[PDB]
Amino acid sequence: ETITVPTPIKQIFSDDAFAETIKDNLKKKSVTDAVTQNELNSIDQIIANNSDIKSVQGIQYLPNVTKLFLNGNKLTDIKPLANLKNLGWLFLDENKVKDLSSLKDLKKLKSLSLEHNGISDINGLVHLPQLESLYLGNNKITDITVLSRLTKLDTLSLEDNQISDIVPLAGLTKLQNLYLSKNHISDLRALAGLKNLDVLELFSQECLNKPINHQSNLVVPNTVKNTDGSLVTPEIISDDGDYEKPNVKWHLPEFTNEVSFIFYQPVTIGKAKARFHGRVTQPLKEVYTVSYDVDGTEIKTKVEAGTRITAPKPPTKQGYVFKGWYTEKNGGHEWNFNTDYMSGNDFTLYAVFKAE
């Protein structure tokens, strides 16, 4: 990771776009110009955003680089950064850097920006407990458990991800600037202790409940909670629904496959004011009953409309053989459970037996 003779820039920096970056940084005339290690040692900062860089191979020869601005390139591989011991600021927004293993030994890193990288797994950040600012907006993150270790952060952006569980933030009392808009957050209790906040964003949450069956009268708990656990009164409820704390209530005489409610709450945490607002969506399943009649009385099964019915364990009667389930007692046709999926209405099937 050192040169000992004068060496052309392009021999070290194999990506032509990055070779041009170094040429301009060192005020050389051509990427073929020879440089010395003394010259490489003089590089403290590289600004090369939107520079069409695919690889930073060769950066390993720059031991003193402290600030690297590489937003809006084509990077996928940060292995060349792994031994840049003095790196303090690293900006990689709008790349395709998903593998974070090579950050492990960057123990002087203070600011890290990885927005718009398609990242889901941030567990590699466990190795950077000294971080002071971290920008992860516009990714695919759901699990922020690792952030409970980042107790030096004063600035954290997680906006535009898929986070519902913010409990890992609860002990991060150094936080001053926290961006959480456009996630799946319904419960602010985790934030109650963040008394040093100056800036807080909680806009535009989208929360999805697990599906339940449609019924004529539905009662769904309001799960939207303020920092003290008090429930946020809905701002508007779909489908003529009503609020009766602690529940949202609907009368749904016709099937519909979802209902929802919107919430809005001005929030104060620490010194920060924010507007916590969003939607809770409740998917509804269309479910009907198959009645299985055996000699004039029935067992019953609920099945979602349009889906496959699994036949019941068949009835047994000594001296008879079960034949099948028919749409009439003494007529109709035999139901085929492999091919005839659930009807959009309740119906009865009749057990038919035959002689041994």
In terms of Cβ atoms closer than 10 Å to its own Cβ (0-12, 13-18, 19+), residue 91 is buried
Q: Say how far residue 332 (Cα) sits from the centre of its chain.
A: 51
CB–CB of 223/186 below 8 Å?
yes
Identity of the residue numbered 8: P
What is the DSSP-derived secondary structure letter of residue 109? -
CATH superfamily of 7-200: Ribonuclease Inhibitor (3.80.10.10)
The b/e string for 156-192 (b: 16+ C-beta within 10 A; e otherwise) is bbbbbbebeebebbeebeebbbbbbbbbebbbbebbe
Give dist(CA 297, CA 255) in Å, integer: 28
| Distance from the first to the final alpha carbon of the chain | 87
Burial class of 61 by CB neighbour count within 10 A (0 to 12, 13 to 18, 19+): buried
Residues contacting residue 96 through CB under 8 Å, at least 6 positions apart: 74, 75, 76, 117, 118
Burial class (CB in 10 A: 0-12, 13-18, 19+), 331: exposed
The arrangement of secondary structure in 208-285, i.e. its CATH architecture, is Sandwich (2.60)
- Radius of gyration of the CA atoms of the chain, in A: 31
DSSP reduced 3-state for 113:
strand
Whats the size of the chain, residue-wise?
356
CA 201 to CA 192: how far, in whole Å?
Answer: 15
Q: Comparing C-alpha atoms, which of 255, 348, 343 is closest to residue 305?
A: 343
Q: How far apart are CA 171 and CA 156, in angstroms?
A: 14
CA–CA dist 183, 143 (Å, integer): 12
Return d(Cα 305, Cα 289) in angstroms, integer: 9
Please state, in angstroms and rounded to a whole number, the distance separating the CA atoms of residues 261 and 4: 68
Amino acid identity of 108? K
Residue pair 169/194 in contact by the 8 Å Cβ criterion? yes
Let me know: does 124 contact 106? Beta carbons within 8 Å. Answer: no
Cα distances from 194 to residues 58, 161, 170, 227, 264, in angstroms, run 43, 21, 7, 10, 21
Start-end of CATH 2.60.40.1220 domains in the chain: 208-285
Structure's resolution in angstroms: 1.5
Amino acid at 107: K
Locate CATH 2.60.40.4270 in the chain: 287-355
Q: Which fold has domain 287-355?
A: Immunoglobulin-like (2.60.40)
* Structural tokens at position 125: 């950040």
